Design an enzyme around this catalytic site. Sequence first.
Site, PDB file in Angstrom:
ATOM      1  N   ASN A  83     -57.676  12.499 -51.496  1.00 43.33           N
ATOM      2  CA  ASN A  83     -56.106  13.624 -50.405  1.00 43.33           C
ATOM      3  C   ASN A  83     -55.403  12.401 -49.425  1.00 43.33           C
ATOM      4  OD1 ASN A  83     -58.481  15.592 -50.384  1.00 43.33           O
ATOM      5  ND2 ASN A  83     -59.595  14.672 -49.224  1.00 43.33           N
ATOM      6  N   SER A 103     -58.699   9.516 -48.127  1.00 42.00           N
ATOM      7  CA  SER A 103     -60.350   9.800 -48.230  1.00 42.00           C
ATOM      8  C   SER A 103     -60.011  10.295 -49.289  1.00 42.00           C
ATOM      9  CB  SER A 103     -60.672  10.775 -47.605  1.00 42.00           C
ATOM     10  OG  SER A 103     -60.394  12.305 -47.111  1.00 42.00           O
ATOM     11  N   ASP A 140     -62.254  12.965 -52.350  1.00 46.24           N
ATOM     12  CA  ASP A 140     -63.597  14.484 -52.788  1.00 46.24           C
ATOM     13  C   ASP A 140     -64.716  12.954 -54.140  1.00 46.24           C
ATOM     14  OD1 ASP A 140     -63.707  15.505 -51.080  1.00 46.24           O
ATOM     15  OD2 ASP A 140     -61.585  16.687 -51.249  1.00 46.24           O
ATOM     16  N   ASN A 169     -67.127  14.181 -49.692  1.00 46.88           N
ATOM     17  CA  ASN A 169     -65.998  12.836 -48.809  1.00 46.88           C
ATOM     18  C   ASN A 169     -66.695  11.686 -48.490  1.00 46.88           C
ATOM     19  OD1 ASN A 169     -63.998  12.448 -46.605  1.00 46.88           O
ATOM     20  ND2 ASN A 169     -63.004  13.921 -48.313  1.00 46.88           N
ATOM     21  N   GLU A 214     -66.301  23.586 -56.383  1.00 46.30           N
ATOM     22  CA  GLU A 214     -65.638  22.271 -56.222  1.00 46.30           C
ATOM     23  C   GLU A 214     -65.104  21.700 -57.563  1.00 46.30           C
ATOM     24  OE1 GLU A 214     -64.920  20.889 -53.399  1.00 46.30           O
ATOM     25  OE2 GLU A 214     -65.755  22.505 -51.711  1.00 46.30           O
ATOM     26  N   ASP A 228     -55.167  12.005 -45.461  1.00 49.60           N
ATOM     27  CA  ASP A 228     -56.691  11.040 -44.537  1.00 49.60           C
ATOM     28  C   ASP A 228     -56.510  10.360 -45.142  1.00 49.60           C
ATOM     29  OD1 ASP A 228     -58.394  12.160 -46.311  1.00 49.60           O
ATOM     30  OD2 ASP A 228     -59.381  12.546 -44.203  1.00 49.60           O
TER      31      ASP A 228
END
Length: 130
Positions: free
Chosen positions: A46, A51, A53, A60, A35, A49
């Site tokens: 991202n 959003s 991380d 998220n 990750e 959408d």
Amino acid sequence: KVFERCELARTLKRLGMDGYRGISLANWMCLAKWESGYNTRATNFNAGDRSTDYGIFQINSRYWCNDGKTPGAVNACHLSCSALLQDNIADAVACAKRVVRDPQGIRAWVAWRNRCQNRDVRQYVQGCGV
Ligand SMILES: [Cl-]
Ligand SMILES: [Cl-]
Ligand code: NA
């Protein structure tokens, strides 16, 4: 902060991650590795959408933390996403625990399925004294 493998393994064990909701320490180590590369300040927007991380576990903002700019987002961990960018991973671990309390468990992270599921993850904790 960029953790060294064993340093992180020992820290996660002390925070009670070994066997949390049936998830072994080695699985958590494999997850953090893929990750963020054990980096607590890692962020990933991202565009698809809107959003982002956050942190070592790349949690998220749409469901787990609040950053205020994500459309229709909730804050299940009841934390500011800023909390997941600290060197001290206590808050990130508490939120990760919340994530796996949902039915999907560790499967919530797609990277886990791709790089950890059904593999020999022993190598992530070998020689760390945990
Ligand atoms: Cl907070
Ligand atoms: Cl907040
Ligand atoms: Na959110």
